[PDB]
Amino acid sequence: GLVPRGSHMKLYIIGAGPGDPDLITVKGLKLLQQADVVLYADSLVSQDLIAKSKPGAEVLKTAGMHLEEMVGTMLDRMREGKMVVRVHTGDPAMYGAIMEQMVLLKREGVDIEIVPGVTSVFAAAAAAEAELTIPDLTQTVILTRAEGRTPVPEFEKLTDLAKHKCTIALFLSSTLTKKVMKEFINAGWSEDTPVVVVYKATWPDEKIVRTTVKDLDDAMRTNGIRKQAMILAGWALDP
Amino acid sequence: GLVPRGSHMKLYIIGAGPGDPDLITVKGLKLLQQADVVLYADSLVSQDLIAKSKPGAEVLKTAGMHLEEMVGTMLDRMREGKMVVRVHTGDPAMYGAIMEQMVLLKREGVDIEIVPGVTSVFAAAAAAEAELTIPDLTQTVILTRAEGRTPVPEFEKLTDLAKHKCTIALFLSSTLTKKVMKEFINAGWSEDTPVVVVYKATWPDEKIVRTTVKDLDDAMRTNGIRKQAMILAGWALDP
Ligand SMILES: Nc1ncnc2c1ncn2[C@@H]1O[C@H](CSCC[C@H](N)C(=O)O)[C@@H](O)[C@H]1O
Ligand SMILES: Nc1ncnc2c1ncn2[C@@H]1O[C@H](CSCC[C@H](N)C(=O)O)[C@@H](O)[C@H]1O
């Protein structure tokens, strides 16, 4: 491009997708292939996607890094004229923890561009061959998380949310299935209501488990699923 | 590939994304480029995405086609040994109306593969630079539609859903903003609660409107948005 526009002062926040390297958007892949600096969280974002960055890119893992340092590193590379990008699992809007870095960067005059991606809810619906909305059955899909030690807001408890009897998709809840069950049975759900668990959707080790509220905790333990699972609950998951 | 596996007896149900041709997944684009037969719904799925199909592909519009005919055409092409694919807006799980064709096709022994895509909810969150989940504010995102003449299930009315005070994302509701407002104010929401409307997210004519419950219907009419809008309501949309 011919003329300087201060385009290094930008962060691209790219929705990698659920894990298969080909479920990134075409646009996210173009940016990932041009970036000079690639930030991401190990074993959640596939290594085969991150290896698509160009020879010479600086690839940084952010897990063991505090907020101000990560941000300070991003700005240093930006101010050296580098194209900097941060790759997030699924779509960043769902528990991507992007707001804190955005607020600090915009105060330093950085532009943000978020590139939307395939969220794991939808990757799991697809793998399960389910549409989450069924005319005359349910027209609402509730994205949430079960409460473990970190409480959820007062008006968002799983039981209250489950009184709507629609489709419920649980993030960050694979080791909270006893709590999920209790919450569903206290809302009045049948213990036979369908629950589909998709562990690592789209990865080579994906597992699809079909079960019900009553066997949820046993199907989790029996199948060894203790992380990275998307739980789809409702009559739209009836096979 | 060396040996016959009955691989023509398959339907790929591909999540095109919100509209920009580059927000299709890399995988959906590969399938779209190989397909012999491409089915889709005009002006909702961009022409520039559908033009990526290969020279010679048969491109069929399905709007003016009944269920059994579309299905009967899909099977005829399958049984001639053709690779057949159907391209749906956003992600097919959200009001993609895929279940009816799946049930009829599986009875004829067809395999289904759904390729998840970027739903318009997430395309609109990105355009608005918003994360929909904020620790200590909201951990739940409710995907639904306002009720016009086609009623929603009894336990899924907008007001009841809005008592959770979380993020609410309305599909198919751009000309129902008076009903949405009433439903939000009856649930007790402040009339100042942020509402972001993204009309045609990612298309060349995208418009981002920032407003509140109280000015929702006027901001829609004033901006001329009467279709293809994604309404994100909640304190997570506070700019
Ligand atoms: N490939 C995958 N399969 C199943 N669940 C997944 C997943 N990737 C992420 N998750 C879900 O996401 C949680 C992490 S929170 C990050 C979610 C991501 N923003 C997205 O849109 O998918 C996990 O606990 C699990 O609930
Ligand atoms: N590009 C876009 N911008 C805004 N809303 C859009 C959109 N594409 C589809 N929609 C939303 O989707 C509705 C059609 S129902 C089909 C939705 C699609 N399955 C998806 O996941 O996005 C529209 O009324 C509008 O609410």
UniProtKB/Swiss-Prot annotation, chains A, B:
Any one GO MF annotation of this record: precorrin-4 C11-methyltransferase activity
Keywords, comma-separated and alphabetical: Cobalamin biosynthesis, Methyltransferase, S-adenosyl-L-methionine, Transferase
Cited Gene3D superfamilies: Cobalt-precorrin-4 Transmethylase, Domain 1, Methyltransferase, Cobalt-precorrin-4 Transmethylase, Domain 2
Pathway named in the protein's UniProt entry: Cofactor biosynthesis; adenosylcobalamin biosynthesis; cob(II)yrinate a,c-diamide from sirohydrochlorin (anaerobic route): step 4/10
Gene Ontology biological process terms, A to Z: cobalamin biosynthetic process; methylation
Catalytic activity: Co-precorrin-4 + S-adenosyl-L-methionine = Co-precorrin-5A + S-adenosyl-L-homocysteine + H(+)
Pfam family, one: TP_methylase
SUPFAM superfamilies membership: Tetrapyrrole methylase
PROSITE patterns linked: SUMT_1
EC number: 2.1.1.271
Disulfide bonds: none
Subunit field text: Homodimer.
Family as reported in the entry's similarity comment: Belongs to the precorrin methyltransferase family.
UniProt protein name: Cobalt-precorrin-4 C(11)-methyltransferase
Species in which this protein is naturally found: Priestia megaterium
Lineage of the species this protein comes from: Bacteria, Bacillati, Bacillota, Bacilli, Bacillales
